[PDB]
Amino acid sequence: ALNWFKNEFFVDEWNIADVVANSENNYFTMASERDVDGTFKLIELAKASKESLKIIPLGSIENLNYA
Amino acid sequence: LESKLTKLSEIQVNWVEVQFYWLDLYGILGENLDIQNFLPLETSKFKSLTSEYKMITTRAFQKLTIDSLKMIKSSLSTFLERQRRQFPRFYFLGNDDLLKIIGSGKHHDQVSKFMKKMFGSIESIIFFEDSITGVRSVEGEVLNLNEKIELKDSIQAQEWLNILDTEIKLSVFTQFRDCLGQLKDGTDIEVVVSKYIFQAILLSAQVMWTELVEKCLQTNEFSKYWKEVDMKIKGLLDKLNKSSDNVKKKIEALLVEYLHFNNVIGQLKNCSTKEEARLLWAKVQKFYQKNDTLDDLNSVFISQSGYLLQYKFEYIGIPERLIYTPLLLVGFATLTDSLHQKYGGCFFGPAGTGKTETVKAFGQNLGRVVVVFNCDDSFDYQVLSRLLVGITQIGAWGCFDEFNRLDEKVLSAVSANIQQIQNGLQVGKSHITLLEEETPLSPHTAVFITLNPGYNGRSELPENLKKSFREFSMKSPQSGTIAEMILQIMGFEDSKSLASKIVHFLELLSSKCSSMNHYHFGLRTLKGVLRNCSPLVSEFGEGEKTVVESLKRVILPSLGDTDELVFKDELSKIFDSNSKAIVQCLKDAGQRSGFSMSEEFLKKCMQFYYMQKTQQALILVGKAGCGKTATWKTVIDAMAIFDGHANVVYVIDTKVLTKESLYGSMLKATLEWRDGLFTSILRRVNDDITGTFKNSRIWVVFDSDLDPEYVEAMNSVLDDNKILTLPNGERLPIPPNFRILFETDNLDHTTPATITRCGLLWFSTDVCSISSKIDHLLNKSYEALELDKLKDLISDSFDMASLTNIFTCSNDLVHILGVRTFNKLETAVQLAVHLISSYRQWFQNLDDKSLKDVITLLIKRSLLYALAGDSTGESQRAFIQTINTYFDSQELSDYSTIVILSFSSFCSEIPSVSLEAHEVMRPDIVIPTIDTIKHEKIFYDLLNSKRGIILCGPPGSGKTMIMNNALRNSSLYDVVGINFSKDTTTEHILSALHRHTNYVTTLTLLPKSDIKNLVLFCDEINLPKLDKYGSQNVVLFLRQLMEKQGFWKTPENKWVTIERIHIVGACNPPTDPGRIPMSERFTRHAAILYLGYPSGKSLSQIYEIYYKAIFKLVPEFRSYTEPFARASVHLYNECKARYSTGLQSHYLFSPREL
Amino acid sequence: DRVVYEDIPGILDTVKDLWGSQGVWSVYCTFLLSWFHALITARTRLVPHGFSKKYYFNDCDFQFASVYLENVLATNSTNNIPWAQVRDHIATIVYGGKIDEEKDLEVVAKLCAHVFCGSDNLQIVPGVRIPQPLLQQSEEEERARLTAILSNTIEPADSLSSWLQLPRESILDYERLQAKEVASSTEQLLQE
Ligand SMILES: Nc1ncnc2c1ncn2[C@@H]1O[C@H](COP(=O)(O)OP(=O)(O)OP(=O)(O)O)[C@@H](O)[C@H]1O
Ligand SMILES: Nc1ncnc2c1ncn2[C@@H]1O[C@H](COP(=O)(O)OP(=O)(O)O)[C@@H](O)[C@H]1O
Ligand SMILES: Nc1ncnc2c1ncn2[C@@H]1O[C@H](COP(=O)(O)OP(=O)(O)O)[C@@H](O)[C@H]1O
């Protein structure tokens, strides 16, 4: 019954690839709960888009300067 | 003469340090050729320093140099980094050790000292006529190299170290090949044990076992091979009793492996079908061998669950082999699963389950020593990355024990580095880029982490880091199998039933005891029980008496009051069932120390001695002032008497010093390591320049609370690793004679990771009686000073029959700053003895009755001001009434005193005060009342008794006033004023004494003056705030000053001595807002005086004296002094009553307003 | 631009995603592993009944299980596939490594026994059935056959109970609580 509204009215859904492709912004923010990380989706998207990701974790001054 | 000797010793130490530094400099640059051209400016600086050192040496033979050398050490950082790059195992050595090993151009004996640091299982190198014959393991095993290494004079350390490293692998492979060929010839392993090293025999036996088991698996027969393995195990068990110690260790480890072989074959025999047998054989680890490889070191590979790993053929020695439990095999399987894709192995679960040991055993089975690191808060991103580039170049298997202890920022930051290492291993990258320098990546490296989640003060790994590790749960180990196999190996005739009884007893003790937080009865206590039962077979035999005695000696001291009865009942239910010299030595040590050997004290001393006999780290827990320090000091004295080994003790307070001062801190400006205090002590013990610590027992006592953040940095020290892993990479071993003591009052905040590692002694009640404590205190006070006649008078007057009822009556009083009456005896005894020794001058001109009455009056006064000195006026009156009734004796009243020997009162002691008009603004003026002179006299009497004084009372009561008024009329004491705040440190106290004291090396913090003592008046002592674990830095610092009489200097880790500095504290009631209760371990050392508000009549009299002094200016209104003062006092009282703290927080009124 | 990443709620959606993200027995084992991963990740959301705690299964576990399956199929060229070995390794080492409890290990082993039973006719869900590969198909033909099997599946409204083999009481409790929370939130959202 909860999903009936989505199945009835809205006839389209957007995944991460659709949001990245259909947005004019060059800056994106990703949020998730603890113990769930979605960087593999971004790596797969970069592989599909034939681009290169530079994975820079933050937390230290050396990584901040590198970033 | 003593000062001259101390100066000569300091000059000798400085000269020895300068000579060692110059010898290292001469070795690295001053002697070798073609080494001066790398850095020409540093070459010229080294030439100038060498010329200065030569001139100084010529002047001495006929400071600033050390400063210049230390300045040019920073110029040698790049050179040392390149030297570490040349031989990658130098990352485990310090800079001074690196200087020593490079500078040994022709000595070639300093490298055998650092074998243990660099290699982990080699303690020395066997030399023979300027050549290397072989290496010697830590356990004493001797490995002979295949070919002798020829050494020259121009050769330096790195290339001969590299060829020795390769020769060790070649020798291990050669011994393995010879042993495997001899086993293929058909001989039994009992003759092969006494020929080759343990690792070769282990690998050959494993290869033969897997080949024969696969042969038996080609068919469906296992009984013949199972019986053959059983006879082999019986043969090794028979050979165990008739072999040397080295062969004993070798046979024990082979027995572990053969018991695993027999277990696997027996499990395979009981399989119903072929598929179950095939699955079981695929699950267990198998040691195959390539027959077509032309490379020798890659010819043996290890298979488990399909995946393949390569044996490295690194020297292991004869390690303590672990019992093969099913959890161990599943852990090996998941480690192989993680390492197949070059990931990182990970184990998580509660402490004492076999995680670090499992990783080490996996490394040993894979033929390499696992280098284990103990992570800490100080491990920043740069330090951890330096450790990673140390272990990637070497190729060693790095285990990061306690990975939760890292900061969350560091855990997030090193995720890129760990992913880079994993990707470089997976894709075969030759060079990885870490810390902006391209370093080679050895294909043998791996990373392991063993976190312990679910504890306080531990971070959580981010998921982008946890996705790089394959974690496995290690919640429940199999203690039954471990106990059964260990008991079988040690020679116990009944092993299955005995191990089942041990495990059942431990389970029932865990289930039927009180729910205290320090009761952990897991795998570590079973290992301790077995390790204690191993020596006991000489005097008890391999049976049930041995295990019963071991269970008692391990578990009983850590139990409470009723838990001891539960232990005795359960030990009687499950199990069926001289020490004269040590007891005599203990009694002699107590007699020389002045203690009274009761049943409780002797029982605690026996428990301490028997538990330390096999345990290296101890915790002593009990009430404040229950007898912990006396216990371990008496036992150490008895140890020195009984064994003849001298004892050195280092009492360190853990929470007074910061971690950077305790362990150490890298200086980020120059990347230079600075030794802490415990690290400095350990390094001095390990180096042993003078040979003093060779045959002496070293005790390090941590006399403070068990902060997890402070103690879990020593996790690798406490457990079987016995290695202090520093951030810079140094691996300081713990000698067998180096023991660590933990003295604490509670275990509320400590973790099970610390309690389980250390043997624990619990003090349920005080170890001394009340009268025995009084007698010992009297003896100490007598020794601190006719004398024989006066000693009998005080002791006879201390009648215990009235004293016990006096103490019972005193227990009912209301005491501010609550201290047990067992702890207040020092004030009473020392004050009474000081008063007797003060009035001894006029004790030769009076009769015996007068002497008895004066002594009784002084003892009654001391008992009053000790037992009820921290109570209100009405309570003090009630207590003086009850001490008068509970003692013919001279009566002491509320104002009784002795003047110069006659008894008088305070009403005749009041001096007339006629203040001038202009003297009101002088802050040192005090109007003498009864309470003022009484408090002043008792404060001066307590301060002359060499005791700390804590003055308690409401604000504006007159604590600082009584301080200044008592100390103004004396030329023997100076006063320094320190006002504590919410955020006060030890550095503020030391800064307030920098202009008042002198540092003299006779170190000693003597007062600046020569005739006047110094009094440290600390105000608002409650104000310094607790940390997140509930401890005050300043309060423990002042407790250290009062009790131990000194402190450890943070920068040069040296001990000072406080000689003529007294401490007086001023505090408010703890019920006041913003005030916190201080620890009783500090308040135990200080006499407490309660200074209350003056009475309304007394306030009116004081301020009518003030108003008369004022109205001396206006003579026509001198008749209104009393109404004005009474009006002002009434106004103050009504303002105090009406406007309370409940309306506003700043509505605090005092006589300061008046 | 803000994107919140979370696991796909549906079971069939998870199977479709894991299948579209990718001899013939390797394809068959990958299909079975994708089904098993979807079922176990759907079971993880039921905190008090599906498991005894909150476990998170991610793409690394699927990658390791797939690598193990490929290694088993590569090293056993006799086509006597050790399904018991695969069951034990996946339920104990790959997916059961993080499992700290014992009943959860039992339910993971039962899920592996249901999915990786290696029978000719496998009823992984009450509607769909996965026949084993034949001896003359191709890789592309096998992929087409398995995606045709997946496409024809229609997920019933009680997939949290009928597909996971669970009693309906806890499923009804969980669904009722979630529906109540969402409906109350949108009721107080719609009133103003
Ligand atoms: N057997 C004994 N005979 C005489 N005096 C004893 C005996 N045992 C302990 N005492 C006395 O008990 C007092 C307090 O004991 P101790 O110094 O060992 O305290 P502690 O356990 O170190 O406490 P804290 O945490 O306050 O430092 C000492 O002054 C000591 O003289
Ligand atoms: N077969 C075995 N497996 C695991 N632990 C064992 C075995 N035999 C003995 N032990 C003992 O169990 C203890 C496990 O400690 P460990 O779990 O490694 O500490 P940590 O929890 O810090 O890693 C060790 O002291 C070791 O002596
Ligand atoms: N002879 C006296 N007897 C009692 N109280 C006095 C006498 N003379 C002054 N006082 C009051 O005692 C106060 C001293 O308070 P003070 O000691 O400074 O507070 P604290 O105890 O918090 O340091 C003075 O403000 C003064 O008003």
Ligand SMILES: [Mg+2]
């Ligand atoms: Mg550990």
